[PDB]
Amino acid sequence: LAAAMLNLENKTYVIMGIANKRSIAFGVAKVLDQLGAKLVFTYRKERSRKELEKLLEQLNQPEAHLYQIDVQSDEEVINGFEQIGKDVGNIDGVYHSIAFANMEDLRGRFSETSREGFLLAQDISSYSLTIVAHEAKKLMPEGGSIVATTYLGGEFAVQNYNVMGVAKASLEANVKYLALDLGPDNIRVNAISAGPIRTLSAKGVGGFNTILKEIEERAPLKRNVDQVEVGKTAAYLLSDLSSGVTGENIHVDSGFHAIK
Amino acid sequence: NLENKTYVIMGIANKRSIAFGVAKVLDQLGAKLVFTYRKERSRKELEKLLEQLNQPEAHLYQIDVQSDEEVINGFEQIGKDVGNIDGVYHSIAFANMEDLRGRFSETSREGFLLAQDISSYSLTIVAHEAKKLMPEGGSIVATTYLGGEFAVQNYNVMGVAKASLEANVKYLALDLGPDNIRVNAISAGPIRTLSAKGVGGFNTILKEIEERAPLKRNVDQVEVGKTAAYLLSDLSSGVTGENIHVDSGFHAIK
Amino acid sequence: LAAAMLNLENKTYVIMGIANKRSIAFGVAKVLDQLGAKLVFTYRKERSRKELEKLLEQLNQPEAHLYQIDVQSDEEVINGFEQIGKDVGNIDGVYHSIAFANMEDLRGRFSETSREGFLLAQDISSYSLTIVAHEAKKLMPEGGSIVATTYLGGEFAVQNYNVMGVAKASLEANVKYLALDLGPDNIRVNAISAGPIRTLSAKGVGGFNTILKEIEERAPLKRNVDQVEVGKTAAYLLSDLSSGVTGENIHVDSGFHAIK
Amino acid sequence: LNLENKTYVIMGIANKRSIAFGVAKVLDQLGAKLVFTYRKERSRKELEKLLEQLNQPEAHLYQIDVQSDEEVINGFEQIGKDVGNIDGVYHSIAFANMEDLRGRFSETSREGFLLAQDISSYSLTIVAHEAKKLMPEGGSIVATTYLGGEFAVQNYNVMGVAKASLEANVKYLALDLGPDNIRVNAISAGPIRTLSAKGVGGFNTILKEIEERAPLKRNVDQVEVGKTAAYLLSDLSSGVTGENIHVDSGFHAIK
């Protein structure tokens, strides 16, 4: 009004990991756009470029700056972020919403996990944050905010989660280490731990429907969450409201983290 | 982010009170505020301190959280005077000087229980009474410290009272989440306040944050009030039982 | 058969909180008794004095030394421990297995808890470690080890547990503060976080039967724990085998803590 | 109690001051038969001399580089064939490139990150798989971690992320393998002067901090870790699994 203490209006954020309209990264987009932020979107699959194009109705007026980045490729993220920088100039944060593991590994007994599948999960689900934070920083000379999305399975052993649990525990340590390293550069680093939400990747998690229902009967709030509730915490964490907050993990999960 | 909401802020002593940073932040965001204080002789710092933008009173009620009557009658009166409410900010704690000074194993039964009473149980009754004024739901926030999670040098009995308060929060959040009332804590980094004088070696704890916290700077009262505004508002829709550390990232290191 | 790594065998341990033979503290006594230790027992109630005398076979010779101590009274625990010292000389540790809350409270909606109810639970389940630790330390000139008994309800908001949940978060912080304080005195202080066991006190917990069957179905080891399992970890903590362990909380719970 | 008739595979001995050597000493004294594994020829030759000690052969020294599926599978089959089936594994293996640990976390190379995970974290997963084949009635697996897996500690970097991963590996393994009556647990050891420790920047300051700030006001040694390991490896820790015990003078529990 200005209740720009948010300060996020006419600042630019990069949102990585929109697949389709149920993507967590999409509820983030929706909430930042509404608050006046300029947005740059990166994707891996050509199908996700098409959904982005159709999705950007909504309020951003170019492009909304659609770049192709596979986090497995050092080259693609170095050169993707260099190009963002040349095309829109400097950046104020990044929302990271990228994970992957093989369906077979997740199914599927943990002690049987292959080396390639263990390491693939760490590659895409954890390390990607680290090169991404490194390349993005370059476009952030007076600081900024990076936010990654995690699951309670990085903190506790959860039934069908297997190798992804381990990849999230690793993501979560990566966040604190990036926070200590990038803090003197006025960069904040944080995670949202989201409750379960029906998305494209979610149907690769076994017993997914049973866990929805557990939150419903068991979480403090006796409901589950949606993408725009994550988006609203992303907005806090990306804004100046979270000024004093780094290395932290915010559960947007109806309070399930706090119970039994 | 907006006006139209009424929040009760408990625990302003003066201009450096954490609950004053909260006040300021909520006032700028357009909230109507209600203020509690402990003793009738300091009603007058307080009205004087409250310029600021609130237009009456701003609704000042005397509540010593040790009395069951005073919390009940107090909130009763608040609902009568201003109607019903959106949230509460809790920023009260106390322990005896001689307890915190003071080897922990030497603590007395009554000084132990006094810290528990004032720093912990008060969130319980206040949440019960405040709920009566929150028929669509709302948000309750309490202020805690790192010494509730970890044994910290001269914190002693308050350390145990804060871990009490932190478990207090989680349980209230379970009990009250069906009523649509969310309950969260903010673990604040060290801030120079009137009550800070009771914490031994305070210079050394601030210098430690500068040298060691990710941010390499101490936090302020308004920084707390900003995370409080997130917590109190709809911004934090799915969050309850949580403890947001507003402390330059110190909770996360070594 | 030296251990003698354990270093338990001609040593005196005060055991507080035996009601009958299914008391978690009785699991402790049978295990230290087996390991060669001298034992001192404290009771509150009369009913436990007759319970204790009969129960005290086993292979402990005198009384073995039974003191009435009600942890609500400063005098009882100062004089109690002062008597233990006159009668047996100095001591090597304390097993603390004492807690109480009004059943009306745990019943029970947490926000409705009375102030007397809440402070009662704190006094007995939490403050009691602090004077006991203080009074016993006067019999441990050379150092020593003190263990209290906790529950997952101290870390997570659990359905029928309420004010006791809050009293166990407090106890656990009490163990950490006492470790920091008493460490330079070479007194280690630690907690065991026990899973559910059918004891006389377990009556006070609504739906105990249900939290029994959940451990068995969900806990890594797919089974419940018994009192001698807690006992063995208590031997471990009381012994020199845990020589470098202080302020710690060990979960004897089949792995329940580590999941979901 | 606390005895013989048990057989433990101990992995990660380099020299007289390897943490796992402290574990070996403690177990050796408690009557166990010890099988040892090593990567470098250098370490085998340190093992042979260290074996004086009580163990009467070999003790059963096996070359196993946890980087090859093939060597951990073939090594454990051979351990099977040579000493029969087993009662537990003590795992003390970790690696990171020195450049990394120096060395600003945000600059970490992809390949340095995945190397830390491969050797420091995944190794427990396959070790557990192959070990389990020699433990038809159950047993106990212990891995060695460090507070830096829980908190961003100064020069620790890529190794802290690999221990965070390790620490989760233990919990998920515990859940998977607990029906099979196998317990899995970690010991979070305080800082101790070992071959690999001198790869950690400012170790010497991270030593003296424990002595001034830890409840106990001293650091620990390899044998204190071996006494906890002895607890975890034996039935004395019967109901305990997916747990992390800090043998660190209480450091984990303060400020």
Ligand SMILES: NC(=O)c1ccc[n+]([C@@H]2O[C@H](COP(=O)([O-])OP(=O)(O)OC[C@H]3O[C@@H](n4cnc5c(N)ncnc54)[C@H](OP(=O)(O)O)[C@@H]3O)[C@@H](O)[C@H]2O)c1
């Ligand atoms: N939904 C839930 O309950 C659930 C529960 C808890 C925590 N989380 C966390 O939420 C985050 C986002 O997932 P979502 O549920 O919103 O699913 P989503 O719609 O399926 O999208 C996941 C995104 O990951 C991207 N991605 C995968 N590998 C990539 C690579 N190598 N390079 C670049 N992008 C890659 C995918 O890109 P392409 O489509 O272009 O391949 C996709 O856009 C995940 O990190 C998840 O781990 C979600």
Ligand SMILES: NC(=O)c1ccc[n+]([C@@H]2O[C@H](COP(=O)([O-])OP(=O)(O)OC[C@H]3O[C@@H](n4cnc5c(N)ncnc54)[C@H](OP(=O)(O)O)[C@@H]3O)[C@@H](O)[C@H]2O)c1
């Ligand atoms: N300063 C910090 O470093 C610090 C940092 C970390 C987290 N925490 C937590 O933040 C909270 C607020 O403290 P502060 O530092 O902002 O100090 P503060 O300005 O001195 O405020 C403390 C408030 O507690 C009130 N209070 C004490 N006993 C009471 C009782 N029986 N009934 C009603 N009110 C009572 C005091 O009222 P009167 O003065 O009017 O009597 C005072 O207004 C406390 O909960 C504290 O434990 C504070």
Ligand SMILES: NC(=O)c1ccc[n+]([C@@H]2O[C@H](COP(=O)([O-])OP(=O)(O)OC[C@H]3O[C@@H](n4cnc5c(N)ncnc54)[C@H](OP(=O)(O)O)[C@@H]3O)[C@@H](O)[C@H]2O)c1
């Ligand atoms: N049983 C379990 O499932 C269980 C499980 C997980 C964690 N925990 C924790 O385990 C601990 C041990 O209880 P338990 O289950 O073994 O039950 P128990 O056999 O009922 O023993 C409880 C002991 O508390 C004593 N006590 C209560 N108030 C006292 C006082 N004011 N002064 C002296 N002694 C007092 C009782 O003595 P009198 O009968 O003579 O009054 C009794 O000896 C409790 O602290 C509990 O909080 C318990």
Ligand SMILES: NC(=O)c1ccc[n+]([C@@H]2O[C@H](COP(=O)([O-])OP(=O)(O)OC[C@H]3O[C@@H](n4cnc5c(N)ncnc54)[C@H](OP(=O)(O)O)[C@@H]3O)[C@@H](O)[C@H]2O)c1
């Ligand atoms: N010392 C400390 O204070 C420090 C303390 C905090 C926690 N921990 C944890 O302690 C554990 C044991 O280390 P330590 O300090 O005792 O070090 P150490 O004596 O240097 O032993 C490290 C061991 O790791 C083995 N290793 C490395 N890469 C391997 C590979 N690819 N395959 C098989 N073995 C491999 C080494 O074998 P080769 O020599 O044959 O190459 C060596 O025996 C580590 O996991 C560490 O992370 C130690």
Ligand SMILES: Oc1cc(Cl)ccc1Oc1ccc(Cl)cc1Cl
């Ligand atoms: O589960 C996933 C699996 C993959 Cl391969 C990729 C993304 C995923 O996202 C999630 C979906 C549902 C829940 Cl409960 C947790 C997470 Cl991390």
Ligand SMILES: Oc1cc(Cl)ccc1Oc1ccc(Cl)cc1Cl
């Ligand atoms: O310390 C206090 C002591 C009392 Cl008797 C009352 C309030 C207090 O408030 C604080 C001030 C500074 C820090 Cl570091 C932590 C806290 Cl809980």
Ligand SMILES: Oc1cc(Cl)ccc1Oc1ccc(Cl)cc1Cl
């Ligand atoms: O629950 C209790 C309640 C009271 Cl009034 C006294 C002792 C208790 O002891 C217990 C018994 C069972 C479980 Cl599951 C947990 C605990 Cl702490």
Ligand SMILES: Oc1cc(Cl)ccc1Oc1ccc(Cl)cc1Cl
């Ligand atoms: O530091 C290490 C570095 C490497 Cl590459 C391998 C093993 C190590 O072992 C340690 C030694 C000291 C401390 Cl404090 C922590 C750890 Cl994990």
